[PDB]
């Protein structure tokens, strides 16, 4: 039963994979689970890279705005 | 000069404020964007535009069923294909189609599994030859 | 080391071991591809200077946008590390110059949009003819069609009421080139359905109803009827005389 993001995302990946194999009309032929593994590896790598980039961009913009506000306050005080 | 620099940074300050405001929207979304990007990456290499649209709409409905957030205006090129990469692909000789750009981004973002190309026209053989030079 | 596998054979034979461990990508021509290609061909054959100016303007605009993004990134990185004020002044002056360059370069769009609206009918007719030829290609293995052959047919049209004249020459030349690739029954199929397509696009709705009645009575599916006007088009009178005299081949 779903408690965190992890259970929801693994359920959504499993259910989408089942739907995709259902549309393809594989019939009685076996379904290759290679697509699921490839998608999962791509998901973890891409979410790690995107989280790193987004956190770096956020702290970058935050320190830029902080420096600009500090300079504005220093100019206003003087 | 400092006063002029402060006064001229109105647009930059507005953009920074908009980015700070939309950081919550992006962080509420990032998992869903990564899921749909990876599904594009590993599922619709070998599908036409109609099948891609049907798969995408049923994926969007199913993803909204489990209540995880995603963009109402999400696109593959707007998320994975960068401006420098798009410039390089267009100057190599690729067409301007969104389908071709999506497939090109799918092919060049595969550092794990080798990509397979079914190009009847034999156009991106010389496009990729242009990309890697000599 | 990076490996790429290329194949020019659609619907080939990929082994299951190879199929299961690669990122299989198809590459087919869609509506947008043929429409953009035919717009480019007709523009570079009609007004070559206009097409060259348009493509140079597009390349300049995207390069200027890339330079603007890179300049914004450099400005942000430079201010993050803190003479300097003069550098920031030069950067924002260059950014303003880029912005006014875009503003001055974004004034040729209405002519391009008018050309798009003018030649959209040629684009849609071309993609419809290509769809019909692909239908022929999947009816039998010998009747396949390549996009390069179709584009070379356009080049032959342009080498050999103006847009209507281009469309007329297009239909005549594409029939005269791709009739020889089909047998007699598909020759009749292609000729009659293409004359039907032209007359449906050009003439009115009563003409469409009349032609549906003609094809239906020739198909033994629809009986009777026609909605023939009193001041008939002379060809329709001959066609109804032919079908009433049971001269089907005529």
UniProtKB/Swiss-Prot annotation, chain A:
It comes from the Eukaryota. It is found in: Cytoplasm, Cytoskeleton. Present with 195 molecules/cell in log phase SD medium. Belongs to the dynein heavy chain family. The dynein complex consists of at least two heavy chains and a number of intermediate and light chains. Interacts with DYN3. Dynein heavy chains probably consist of an N-terminal stem (which binds cargo and interacts with other dynein components), and the head or motor domain. The motor contains six tandemly-linked AAA domains in the head, which form a ring. A stalk-like structure (formed by two of the coiled coil domains) protrudes between AAA 4 and AAA 5 and terminates in a microtubule-binding site. A seventh domain may also contribute to this ring; it is not clear whether the N-terminus or the C-terminus forms this extra domain. Cytoplasmic dynein acts as a motor for the intracellular retrograde motility of vesicles and organelles along microtubules. Dynein has ATPase activity; the force-producing power stroke is thought to occur on release of ADP. Required to maintain uniform nuclear distribution in hyphae. May play an important role in the proper orientation of the mitotic spindle into the budding daughter cell yeast. Probably required for normal progression of the cell cycle. This is Dynein heavy chain, cytoplasmic. It comes from Saccharomyces cerevisiae (strain ATCC 204508 / S288c) (Baker's yeast). The chain holds residues 2957 to 3034 of 4092 of the full protein.
């Amino acid at each position: 039963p779903i408690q965190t993001i992890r259970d929801a995302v693994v359920n959504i990946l499993i259910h989408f994979d089942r739907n995709f194999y259902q549309k393809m009309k594989v019939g009685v032929n076996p379904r290759s689970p290679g697509y699921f593994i490839d998608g999962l590896r791509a998901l973890v790598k891409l979410v790690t890279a995107k989280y790193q980039d987004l956190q770096e961009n956020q702290r970058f913009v935050n320190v830029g705005l902080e420096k600009l506000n500090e300079s504005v306050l220093k100019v206003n005080e003087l | 000069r400092s006063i002029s620099l402060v006064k001229s940074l109105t647009f930059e300050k507005e953009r920074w404020l908009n980015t700070t405001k939309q950081f919550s929207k992006t962080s509420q979304e990032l998992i869903g964007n990564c899921i749909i990007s990876s599904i594009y990456e590993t599922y619709f290499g070998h599908l036409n535009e109609r099948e891609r649209g049907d798969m995408l709409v049923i994926l969007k409905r199913l993803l909204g069923k489990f209540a995880v957030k995603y963009d109402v205006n999400y696109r593959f090129i707007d998320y994975l294909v960068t401006l420098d990469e798009k410039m390089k692909w267009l100057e190599c000789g690729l067409d301007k189609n969104d389908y071709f750009l999506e497939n090109m981004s799918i092919v060049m973002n595969s550092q794990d599994a080798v990509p397979f190309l079914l190009d009847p026209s034999s156009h991106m053989i010389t496009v990729i030859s242009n990309y890697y030079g000599n | 080391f990076k490996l790429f596998i290329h194949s020019c054979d659609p619907s080939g034979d990929i082994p299951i071991f190879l199929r299961s461990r690669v990122r299989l990508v198809h590459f087919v021509t869609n509506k947008e591809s043929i429409e953009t290609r035919i717009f480019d061909i007709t523009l570079t054959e009609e007004n070559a200077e206009m097409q060259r100016k348009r493509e140079d303007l597009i390349k300049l605009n995207t390069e200027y946008r890339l330079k603007l993004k890179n300049l914004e990134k450099r400005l942000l990185e430079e201010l993050n590390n803190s003479e300097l004020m003069v550098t920031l002044n030069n950067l924002k002056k260059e950014a303003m110059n880029i912005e006014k360059k875009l503003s001055e370069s974004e004034e040729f769009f209405p002519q391009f949009d008018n050309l798009v609206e003018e030649y959209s009918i040629i684009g849609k007719h071309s993609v419809k003819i290509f769809s019909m030829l692909e239908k022929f290609g999947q009816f039998h293995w010998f009747y396949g069609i390549s996009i390069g052959q179709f584009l070379s047919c356009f080049k032959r049209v342009f080498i050999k009421t103006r847009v209507d004249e281009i469309l007329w020459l297009l239909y005549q030349e594409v029939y005269c080139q791709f009739s020889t690739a089909l047998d007699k029954k598909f020759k009749m199929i292609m000729a009659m359905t293409m004359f039907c397509l032209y007359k449906f696009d050009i003439e009115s709705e009563q003409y469409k109803e009349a032609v549906l009645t003609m094809i239906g009575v020739l198909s033994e599916s629809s009986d009777g009827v026609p909605k023939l006007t009193v001041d008939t088009n002379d060809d329709l009178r001959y066609l109804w005389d032919y079908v009433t005299t049971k001269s089907y081949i005529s």
